[PDB]
Structures are given as structure tokens and as C-alpha cells.
Amino acid sequence: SNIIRGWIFGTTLDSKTQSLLIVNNATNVVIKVCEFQFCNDPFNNCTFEYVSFKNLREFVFKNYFKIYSKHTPINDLPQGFSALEPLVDLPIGINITRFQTLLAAYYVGYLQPRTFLLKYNENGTITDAVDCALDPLSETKCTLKSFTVEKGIYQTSNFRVQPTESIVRFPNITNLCPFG
Amino acid sequence: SALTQPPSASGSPGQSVTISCTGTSSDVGGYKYVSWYQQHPGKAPKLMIYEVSKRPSGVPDRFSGSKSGNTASLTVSGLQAEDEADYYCSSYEGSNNFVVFGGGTKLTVLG
Amino acid sequence: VQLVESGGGLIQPGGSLRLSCAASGFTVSSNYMSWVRQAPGKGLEWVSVIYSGGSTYYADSVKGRFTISRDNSKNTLYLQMNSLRAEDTAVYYCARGEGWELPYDYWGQGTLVTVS
Amino acid sequence: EVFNATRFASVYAWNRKRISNCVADYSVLYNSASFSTFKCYGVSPTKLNDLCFTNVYADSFVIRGDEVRQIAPGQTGKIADYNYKLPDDFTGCVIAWNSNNLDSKVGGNYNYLYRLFRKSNLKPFERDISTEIYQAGSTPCNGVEGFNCYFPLQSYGFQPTNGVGYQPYRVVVLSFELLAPATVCGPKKSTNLVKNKCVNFNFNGLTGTGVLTESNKKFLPFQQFGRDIADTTDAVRDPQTL
Ligand SMILES: *[C@@H]1O[C@H](CO)[C@@H](O[C@@H]2O[C@H](CO)[C@@H](O)[C@H](O)[C@H]2NC(C)=O)[C@H](O)[C@H]1NC(C)=O
Ligand SMILES: *[C@@H]1O[C@H](CO)[C@@H](O[C@@H]2O[C@H](CO)[C@@H](O)[C@H](O)[C@H]2NC(C)=O)[C@H](O)[C@H]1NC(C)=O
Ligand SMILES: *[C@@H]1O[C@H](CO)[C@@H](O)[C@H](O)[C@H]1NC(C)=O
Ligand SMILES: *[C@@H]1O[C@H](CO)[C@@H](O)[C@H](O)[C@H]1NC(C)=O
Ligand SMILES: *[C@@H]1O[C@H](CO)[C@@H](O)[C@H](O)[C@H]1NC(C)=O
Ligand SMILES: *[C@@H]1O[C@H](CO)[C@@H](O)[C@H](O)[C@H]1NC(C)=O
Hints:
- The structure is cut from a larger assembly and holds 2 copies of chain A, 1 copy of chain B and 1 copy of chain C.
- By secondary structure, chain A is mainly beta.
- Chain A has one helix at about 135-145, and strands at about 5-10, 30, 50, 55-60, 65-75, 85-90, 100, 120, 125-130.
- In chain A, the strands form 4 sheets. Chain A has a 3-stranded antiparallel β-sheet, with no helix packed on it.
- Chain B is mainly beta.
- In chain B, a hairpin with a 2-residue loop joins strand 5 and strand 6 (about 70-75).
- The termini of chain B are far apart.
- Chain C is mainly beta.
- Chain C has one domain.
- Chain C has strands at about 35-40, 45-50, 55, 65-70, 80, 90-95, 105.
- The interface of B and D includes residues 29 and 31 of B.
- One 2-acetamido-2-deoxy-beta-D-glucopyranose binds near residues 121, 122 and 123 of chain A.
- The PDB classes it as viral protein/immune system.
- The entry lists the keywords SARS-CoV-2, Spike glycoprotein, covid-19, monoclonal neutralizing antibody, Fabs, nsEMPEM, VIRAL PROTEIN-IMMUNE SYSTEM complex.
């Protein structure tokens, strides 16, 4: 029943610092960047604005500020595959390090700088991906640039121990200077 | 330029006299603020008619002439035994915050 | 408003008469004030002003050479002059006030300063 | 909205308006000849629409004839010292245009007030609004306006027959602030579209020489380019007609 309405962003999460706010108050997605005075249980010098279980509203946010989404009908996080179209870009230059949520369930991943392998179909639609560091099979699929590898033996990476602890050695500290 | 005036006016003690104040339309027909000054020989320059309908606080009432178009005019009624002095106009030129003064009107009573 | 201007007299070109307009009765600091002078048989010459913001102006024959000054308190008020000419022959006066607005009402007793 | 505003603001309450998410065509107003002076500092009168700034600040008020000359970088004068102080490095363009045929009125238009006197000059772009009765003399006046103690604000009273010196000159000053993504920038032309000729195209972002031909590829609603197996541009969506 659309219990999740919107988000709240920002560094200091209150005044003295701008703080993005995406909200759907049953009218439109009223984006603001006003350095709000926030409430610890919700449900001033702005620099932007805009006004316009069977739902899976996936979202991805990153930094300026970008958003990707996809609104798929469903019927406990459903397996399967679905790409995310970039529906908005926001040139707000805000510095964010924390966020919250308005108010069903939601989930919070955390992106990482990881190489993938996308399978664009003929329509230009991503249909499948391969985590290029998930497991040896996947590193192989990634170095072959293929989604199938015929029997064989392929070389992928370079095992290399790392030096666990440093050490320093110098002669016996003798011949002290007669400052005494 | 200068708010030129006839150097001399005569009259009878008890009547009025109108001291003129003449300059071009470059100033007098561009602003709304003139300033009259009357000064006994030796006294400090004492203002007479600024905000032409108004005069300074304690000045007597026989003063308060007006301004007609291209000239100001102080209309002082009842020439007293004190009305002999020198007169100098003052206003703001139409350039670079310059202030222009008057040439001088001497009220010359008969002997 | 005891504005006793002093230091005036006959001087040849080159000197700097630090006129001391005592601000004993009225303030010269953080306020508006003006220096002027009248030639023998002449109206007044707007030579300098000083604002509350310390801003200053001079008329044409006095721009570049005339310079205003004052102690910080109501001690005194100066007016410094440079490269003096014969035209400048004009007894000095102080004009409590600032420009066409704020008319001049209070003056000094009159210092005789002949510039020739 | 700022230039064709019927209801302006005074000088002691000089305005400021941050504006975002614009294409800011300066040449439509610059080439309107409705201006008494278009004085640009830091930047050129033309050569602007090829600039992309973070935000612009549209101050809007009404001053007299000589006060327009007062308005300039690092100036000293009644308004500039006590109503609206420009810096010495002001990057922007002052727009002055007469309003005697609009704002002037018989008997005077006494709605506009300027700051009579104050103790100090303003910071660059400082907004002084305090209406504290001008203190002077030797005592805090406490409202009575004693000796040497007067009101800080003075009306204008625009009479229609006044000379240019007293005429209501409406002025708007724009400054160009640069921090952050540039959200306001001048427009960009777009020449006609030519096909079947080796042309040197420059589509909105990307450039290059080719032979543009009507295709049958179906992009997705949001995609713009198309690439080849070797990462070379192969299809471009016409950003005007999709
Ligand atoms: C000089 O003599 C003093 C005598 O106290 C020495 O000071 C101590 O010396 C002992 C001897 O080994 C050390 O264990 C202590 O740590 C010293 N303490 C301090 C506060 O110095 C001192 O080492 C001698 N030499 C010098 C260069 O001062
Ligand atoms: C961009 O602007 C052009 C301006 O003409 C639009 O082209 C018109 O599109 C309408 C849509 O029905 C039709 O009338 C014609 O195809 C075009 N010409 C005219 C005169 O209207 C175009 O649609 C706009 N596209 C976008 C994405 O803004
Ligand atoms: C949603 O909020 C915005 C801003 O607070 C407001 O303009 C809009 O009217 C609101 N809509 C509803 C339905 O309350
Ligand atoms: C934003 O506006 C508020 C309004 O009081 C002000 O206090 C603050 O200094 C402003 N911030 C910036 C960065 O201008
Ligand atoms: C943004 O915030 C982080 C900490 O929250 C800080 O390390 C970083 O320097 C900030 N960015 C800027 C430009 O100050
Ligand atoms: C591509 O888009 C068409 C559009 O109708 C759709 O029918 C088709 O299933 C999509 N996928 C493929 C592989 O053609």
C-alpha cells in the first residue's frame, strides 16, 4: 500500500548542511535540497526543487547525484533478473554520507567497485550479468568474454602472497657518543 | 551655472522685497531642492530657504518665498532694521556631486 | 558647538596648514563633516567632506591636492592642502553638515587664511 | 519575471534571487535596446551564452539618474555606501533603464526609500535592512529623535516633470557565481540536419565525421549512442526529433 514514501539524505542530517529529500506525498516527487531541520520519526535556503506484496521498487543512488529504478510486478526477495533504467539525474553537488527512509519491507545493499560482464540482447536490454570476481568459474567466464566456456584449462589470475609484516635489522648499537 | 542675482535691492522699512535667484534649466529646472542663505557681514552663513516651502527652525516668518520654474525667489515681507545682509543661493549641479553657490545679493537700504 | 578653527594665516605655496576645528561641541568622528572657504567678496567653496564611513570628496580646483584629517575622538578636525595658488585666497570655515542633504548650520568663528 | 516585474523592491531592501536549472539567454535582453546602460564587468556583453555558471543573482530596485553611475565595481556614494555595495571584482552586468513613463506620477511617487545616513560602508553585496533610528549626538535617542538624531530612510516622491536626475531609473544587477555542477547556461544553436553527405557532425556531446543515414535501430527511450563490437560510435539519436 505504498507504505514507503520517500528518502532523506545529507551529511549532518539537519541544519548547517544541505540535505537532499525525495518525497512522494500522494501528489508528486517533491525533490528539495533545502538544509532542513529533520524529524527523528517522519511520515531553509534551498538550491533546487521539482514537483511533478506486488510492487518491487528497486532503486540505486550514487554520486553529482544519480538515480536508477525499476518497478516490476511481483507476488522474501524474489530471485530472477531485472536491469535498472536511469530515470533521473540530479546536478546538486551535495556531499552525502548518510540517509534514512520515510514510511512492507526494504533492503539496503552497498555498491562496490567491481567489474561485471553485461549481456546486452538485440533490443539493447541487459538480460544477464556475470560477477567477474564471484568464483573461479566466473573469473573464467569473464576472461573469456563469454557466457559459456567449452571444456579446457584457462588461466585467470595471479596468486601472490602479501608480505605479512615488515622487519628492520642494523648492527649492534654500540660506540655511543660521549655526551655523558 | 551660478545662481546669479542682481547685486542690489532697495526698499522701504516695512514693505516686502523679493530676492531673486537665477540660473539655467541645467540645475534650477531639474531638481526640487534649493537652499537660500542670508548672512550679516561677519556672521556665519545662515541658511534661509531649503525645501522651498520650508525654512530653518527659528527663522522668522516673513521669509519663505517660493520657486517659479527657472528661478527661485525669497519673498521677505516687512523690511526690518535687521534685513540688511548678503544673500547666497546653493544647490546641486547636474554633474559629479558638484554643489553650486550664489554670486551675492546685497540688500541696500536708502540713507 | 565650539568649532574654534586655528592655524590660519598668510602662507606661500608649499605649506600645510593643519587647521584644528575643535569638535568640542559637536562630533567629527563616526559622523559627517565638511571643510569650505570663502574668498574675499565671494560665496563658499566646497573643498572637502568626510562621511561616517570615512569617505571623502573634493571639488575641481581642490581634487588631487586637498586632503582631510582628524583625530579619532572629538579632539579636532583637520584639512590639509597642497600646491597652493593665489586663487585659494579665501578665509576658511567649517560646515557642520554633509552636502546638499543635511544643510550646513554650524560653523567656525572664522580663520583668516590668505593663500597667495 | 525579474525584468517585467510590475512590483519592484526599494533600495534599502535591495533584492537578490538565486536562479537554477535555466537556459539563460542573455542575448534576448541584451539585444532589446530597452536599456539605458548594460555595463559588464569580468565578462563581455556578448560572448556570454557560451558560459555555464552555477547560479546567477538578480537584484532588482529603482534608483535615480546619477545613482546608476554610482552603481559600478568598488564605488563610493550614498547608495553604494549604505544601500548596495558592489565589490571591486564584481563579475556580472548592470542593467539600467528609465521608468519615468511608467513609475513617475503626478504629485510624486513617495514609495521608494533610500538610506539617509549610517555609520559605515557595507561589505561587498552586504544586505543592510536594520531600521534602527539613526543614532547621533551624545545619547541613545530612544525613539524621540533628539538633537543630531534623525531617521535613516528618506522617500523619493517621483514627480513626472522631474528631470532625468530625479527620474525613476529601474535597475537590475546580475552577478555570476561559480563554485559544483553548472545548472544555468546559455542556449546552444542547432543547425539543420543533413543526410547522405560526409559531414563533420557534432551531436550534443560527441563529435566526429560521418554520413548520417536514417536507420532502423530501436534504442531504448533513454539511450543516446550506439556502439560497435570494438567500441566505435555507430548510431546517434537525433536529440531534437527522436
Ligand atoms: C649522568 O649521571 C646521571 C646520574 O643520575 C645519570 O642519570 C641516571 O643514570 C642512571 C644510570 O644508568 C640511569 O639508569 C637513569 O635513567 C638516569 N636518569 C636520568 C634522569 O638521567 C645520567 O644517565 C648520566 N649521563 C648523562 C648523559 O646524563
Ligand atoms: C522538439 O521541438 C520540435 C519543434 O518543431 C518538435 O517538432 C514538432 O513535433 C510536433 C509533435 O507532434 C509536430 O508538430 C512536428 O513533428 C514538429 N513540428 C512542429 C512545427 O510542431 C519536436 O516534437 C520536439 N521534440 C522534443 C523531444 O522536444
Ligand atoms: C506535497 O508537498 C509539496 C511541498 O510541501 C506541496 O507543494 C504539495 O501540495 C504537497 N501535496 C500534497 C497532496 O500534500
Ligand atoms: C542559507 O540561508 C540561511 C538563512 O538564514 C543563512 O543563515 C545561511 O548562512 C545561508 N547559507 C549560505 C551558504 O549562504
Ligand atoms: C564530504 O564529506 C566527507 C565526510 O562526510 C569528507 O571526508 C569530504 O572531504 C567532504 N567533501 C568535501 C568536498 O569537503
Ligand atoms: C525485443 O523487443 C520486441 C518488441 O516487441 C519484443 O517483442 C521482443 O520479445 C524483444 N526481445 C527480442 C529478443 O526480440
